[PDB]
Design a protein around this ligand. Structure first.
Ligand SMILES: [Mg+2]
Ligand SMILES: [Mg+2]
Ligand SMILES: [Mg+2]
Ligand SMILES: [Mg+2]
Ligand SMILES: [Mg+2]
Ligand SMILES: [Mg+2]
Ligand SMILES: [Mg+2]
Ligand SMILES: [Mg+2]
Ligand SMILES: [Mg+2]
Ligand SMILES: [Mg+2]
Ligand SMILES: [Mg+2]
Ligand SMILES: [Mg+2]
Ligand SMILES: [Mg+2]
Ligand SMILES: [Mg+2]
Ligand SMILES: [Mg+2]
Ligand SMILES: [Mg+2]
Ligand SMILES: [Mg+2]
Ligand SMILES: [Mg+2]
Ligand SMILES: [Mg+2]
Ligand SMILES: [Mg+2]
Ligand SMILES: [Mg+2]
Ligand SMILES: [Mg+2]
Ligand SMILES: [Mg+2]
Ligand SMILES: [Mg+2]
Ligand SMILES: [Mg+2]
Ligand SMILES: [Mg+2]
Ligand SMILES: [Mg+2]
Ligand SMILES: [Mg+2]
Ligand SMILES: [Mg+2]
Ligand SMILES: [Mg+2]
Ligand SMILES: [Mg+2]
Ligand SMILES: [Mg+2]
Ligand SMILES: [Mg+2]
Ligand SMILES: [Mg+2]
Ligand SMILES: [Mg+2]
Ligand SMILES: [Mg+2]
Ligand SMILES: [Mg+2]
Ligand SMILES: [Mg+2]
Ligand SMILES: [Mg+2]
Ligand SMILES: [Mg+2]
Ligand SMILES: [Mg+2]
Ligand SMILES: [Mg+2]
Ligand SMILES: [Mg+2]
Ligand SMILES: [Mg+2]
Ligand SMILES: [Mg+2]
Ligand SMILES: [Mg+2]
Ligand SMILES: [Mg+2]
Ligand SMILES: [Mg+2]
Ligand SMILES: [Mg+2]
Ligand SMILES: [Mg+2]
Ligand SMILES: [Mg+2]
Ligand SMILES: [Mg+2]
Ligand SMILES: [Mg+2]
Lengths: 60, 103, 77, 92, 44
RNA sequence: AGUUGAGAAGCUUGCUGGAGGUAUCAGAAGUGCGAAUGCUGACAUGAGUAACGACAAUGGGUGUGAAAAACACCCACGCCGAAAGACCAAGGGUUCCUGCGCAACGUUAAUCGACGCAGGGUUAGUCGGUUCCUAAGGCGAGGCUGAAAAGCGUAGUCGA
RNA sequence: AACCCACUCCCGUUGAAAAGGUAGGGGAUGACUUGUGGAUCGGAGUGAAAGGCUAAUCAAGCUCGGAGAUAGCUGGUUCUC
RNA sequence: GAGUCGGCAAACAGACUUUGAUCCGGAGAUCUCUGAAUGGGGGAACCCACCUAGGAUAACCUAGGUAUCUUGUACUGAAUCCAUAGGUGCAAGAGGCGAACCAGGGGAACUGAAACAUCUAAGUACCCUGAGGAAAAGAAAUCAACCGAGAUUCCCUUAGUAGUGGCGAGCGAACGGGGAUUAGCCCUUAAGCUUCAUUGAUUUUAGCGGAACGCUCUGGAAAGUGCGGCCAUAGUGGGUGAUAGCCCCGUACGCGAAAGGAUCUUUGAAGUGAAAUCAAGUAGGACGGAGCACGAGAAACUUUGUCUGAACAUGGGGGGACCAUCCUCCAAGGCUAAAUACUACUGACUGACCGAUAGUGAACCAGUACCGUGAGGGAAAGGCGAAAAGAACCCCGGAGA
């Protein structure tokens, strides 16, 4: 959520967090190109989660 | 807010099957209601491809309009209009014949 | 365009009436020639095209006064 | 950037001409981003698969156009890159 | 049997293109008039 | 269909139709069509008539298939060969290739297709572009000229 | 001969073609033919001059406005007594 | 406040959450390349870059900047001794678009006159330039006859009248009455208008509650036939399987705002109005033109292209050639609300308006398809049922139609 990310999570702590779920976005774009992805809710979920951490890095 | 939620039990006014005591399963968005047990329909459906089957004639319920049912009272055992005459922290659905809150 | 830098005269239009009133258009241009005017404070000639009615005003008001309010309407001299 | 490595690759492109290509040779066909250069996908393979690649070729594909009622329809055009690796380290 | 239309693309864009119409003053009135009717194209 | 009035027209009923209708008397009219070489859709006569797009030419077999003069393979005849063959530039815009089909299209039939649906398919330091420089010509800071729009043009920067 | 042009006959005229075809013709190293790119426009251009050409339109294009131009001239003008 | 993942569109998958999930309003963050397009160029949605700081490995990346003009401002300094032009650096503003409205610049012809030149059409169409939510115009060198009226703008009369006119076609006032609206201030420096700081009111961008019915017939289905009763500051609304004040949404009424938006008003501030100082190349005059209803006409008056030229309140200029006598105003410097004109866009209503050859060109994926090198032109296209219950299964057929 967003109330978690406000809670004393600094610039570098959330700045490392973006490079974590870009991996999870990459691995879900590789499995979709191949034939193994049934959890289609996961694919449209990390798009709405990279957007949250980019918002809190402009409001302090 | 709306007179009829999902987990209610109703009776039917002015239909093919009037006076049938029922219970709401699914509410649609064009204020049509699928009441569990009444308004039965039968659909000639082809048996399904892609290693499925449907076979033949299978029943299900067809929805009816929201103006054709009403909240059942179980204290005069007849249909009763409902209202929101009582609200203190929430709009409580309350009957108008007896001024008693529904459950 | 044919305007003056002192008096503000543009060309106007009118007619060219004959002896049977055959109206046709013409332009009334103003007289204006180039001329150099000596100043003393900047001790140099300035050249600007003015009318013959602008020559009469320079001879009346003075050159330094008419150059001043030419600057004080925001123009190039 | 720290980003921009997790954007230029959109998956494999396995088909009849790419299956026989990766076996007789070592060339793997990806479906790269719509505007990427030959350097910034040389780096995103050495990073994301830990293999050394010698050289990369690319090409552009036009989208096929359908013609039904109520106008025409243009499918999305896309780029494509043949990644020619070393004779060892066939990738996954 | 030369017909009156022999096609090209370098001659079509330099005469009827957008940067040809937008350069002059009549052509910028051709753009606003053809836009305000509601045409999809504005540049043939 | 019957029946009543000098007439415009009115009235009662048989079937089809499946939800609106207007005594009476007054108003307000986009108020009555056969014709304007009238306008826009439908259907006739001509008429199952003329034509089926160069007078390079086709004849058997085997196959597939619901169905072969026209499709595939085979055998034999013909025709172009300074093109009816190959290749670059324009121009076009997926017509290229493979499965699946044949209602529509193709001046006939189609199992065939430049035709429908679904996949596939264009790899560059050197070949053409872009980058460098210019011809005719275009635009042109400042600058002159002009009712206003604007016109011409120096430095300059575009244009094979 | 390629190539550019259009002198004759016949066929065609609802053509294969809103200007061709099959046979014959004239020029063919030059007042030549042609590819790409540019310049000149509406009482205005171009023209070895015919009033010819300026997008199958030309004794002054095409399009939108003035404009429902003006017509002592043709054609039409609808239910009963 | 309990369902949800936009529409044509429709299935089968994967899912999210009792209170903030979709959903509705206020504020913010992101905002690719084109386009005034503005770092330089271009064939609009493309190419080539510099500079400053911060990182990064023979190949770069984040963050900014970099257009011309108009003003101002420091620095620099040609022929030339000085010092102007000129050249840099910075600050502020402008540029473009939009249907009509308003003021200016330029301005036709067809057609009327039963021909046609003056004249009409007409200062109309169109084309440029400005500015505003309105603009312009306005505070007497004005009109009236010896009576008096006191800024402008707009409607109704005077009146199709006096005049004007190849005295033809035609064009056409004023004086005086009736109404709408109601402020006059300054050049000794003013109201007023801007822009912030302010204290209250007024609404505005979302909502919430919201009265009263039963049995009985026919029918596929009752709102209808019957028989009764109730509500009312809500009774000719919509829609529910056929005709509903009382079934559903609404209506008459009542309440509603974290937050912005304005509109009146608070009392302060910074400004500005603003030109300095009662008006000189100004009034008037002479040829040449316009505007005045007024086509040189006995032609007054206002204007300006050329040429000239005064008096200084014992002055001046007006009262339709001109002159004497009377009356009435102070020209050559400025500022001003209201009544007024308009609708591309909004919302609420309303109709003796249309009902798919009508009404927008357009109820339908319409400025689309198509026709053009272009500017430009420009169509045809609605309806199953209350509800998809949209036809399982069998027989002929190419395994189709
Ligand atoms: Mg005239
Ligand atoms: Mg390449
Ligand atoms: Mg697209
Ligand atoms: Mg009805
Ligand atoms: Mg009629
Ligand atoms: Mg008829
Ligand atoms: Mg007749
Ligand atoms: Mg026929
Ligand atoms: Mg015959
Ligand atoms: Mg015969
Ligand atoms: Mg025959
Ligand atoms: Mg043939
Ligand atoms: Mg031979
Ligand atoms: Mg030969
Ligand atoms: Mg195709
Ligand atoms: Mg093929
Ligand atoms: Mg056929
Ligand atoms: Mg095909
Ligand atoms: Mg160059
Ligand atoms: Mg040049
Ligand atoms: Mg210039
Ligand atoms: Mg030039
Ligand atoms: Mg040739
Ligand atoms: Mg020859
Ligand atoms: Mg010879
Ligand atoms: Mg002749
Ligand atoms: Mg022609
Ligand atoms: Mg007219
Ligand atoms: Mg006519
Ligand atoms: Mg530029
Ligand atoms: Mg630029
Ligand atoms: Mg502007
Ligand atoms: Mg005439
Ligand atoms: Mg005339
Ligand atoms: Mg008349
Ligand atoms: Mg006449
Ligand atoms: Mg004003
Ligand atoms: Mg004023
Ligand atoms: Mg008096
Ligand atoms: Mg007064
Ligand atoms: Mg409510
Ligand atoms: Mg209610
Ligand atoms: Mg009703
Ligand atoms: Mg019905
Ligand atoms: Mg009702
Ligand atoms: Mg009921
Ligand atoms: Mg004065
Ligand atoms: Mg005078
Ligand atoms: Mg005077
Ligand atoms: Mg006088
Ligand atoms: Mg007098
Ligand atoms: Mg219509
Ligand atoms: Mg109909």
């Amino acid at each position: 959520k967003a109330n978690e990310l406000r809670e004393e999570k600094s610039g570098p702590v959330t700045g490392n967090n973006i490079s974590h779920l870009l991996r999870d976005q990459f691995n879900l774009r590789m499995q979709k190109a191949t034939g193994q992805l049934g959890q289609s809710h996961l694919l449209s979920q990390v798009k709405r989660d990279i957007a949250r951490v980019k918002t809190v890095l402009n409001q302090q | 807010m709306q007179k009829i939620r999902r987990d209610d039990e109703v009776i039917v006014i002015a239909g093919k099957d009037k006076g049938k005591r029922g219970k709401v399963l699914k509410v649609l968005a064009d204020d049509r209601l699928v009441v569990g047990g009444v308004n039965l329909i039968k659909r000639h459906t082809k048996p399904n491809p892609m290693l499925g089957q449907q076979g033949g004639i299978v029943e299900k319920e067809a929805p009816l309009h929201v103006s054709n049912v009403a909240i059942f009272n179980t204290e005069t055992s007849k249909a009763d209009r409902v209202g929101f005459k009582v609200e203190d922290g929430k709009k409580i659905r309350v009957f108008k014949s007896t001024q008693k809150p529904v459950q | 365009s044919r305007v003056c830098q002192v008096t503000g005269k543009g060309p106007v239009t009118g007619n060219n009436i004959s002896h049977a009133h055959n109206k046709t258009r013409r332009r009334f241009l103003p007289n204006l020639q180039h001329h150099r005017f000596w100043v003393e404070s900047e001790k140099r000639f300035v050249r600007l095209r003015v009318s013959a009615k602008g020559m009469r005003i320079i001879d009346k008001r003075g050159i330094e006064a008419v150059l001043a309010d030419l600057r004080a309407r925001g123009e190039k001299f | 950037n720290q980003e921009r490595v997790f954007k230029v690759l959109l998956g494999p492109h396995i088909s009849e001409k790419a299956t026989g290509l990766a076996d007789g040779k070592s060339q793997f066909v990806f479906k790269v981003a719509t505007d990427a250069t030959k350097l910034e996908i040389k780096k995103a393979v050495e990073s994301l698969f830990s293999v050394k690649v010698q050289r990369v070729t690319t090409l552009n594909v036009k989208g096929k156009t359908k013609r039904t009622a109520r106008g025409l329809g243009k499918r999305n055009d896309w780029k494509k890159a043949y990644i020619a690796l070393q004779p060892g380290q066939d990738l996954d | 049997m030369k017909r009156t239309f022999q096609p090209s693309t370098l001659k079509r864009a330099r005469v009827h293109g957008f940067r040809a119409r937008m350069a002059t003053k009549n052509g910028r009135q051709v753009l606003s008039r053809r836009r305000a009717k509601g045409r999809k194209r504005l540049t043939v």
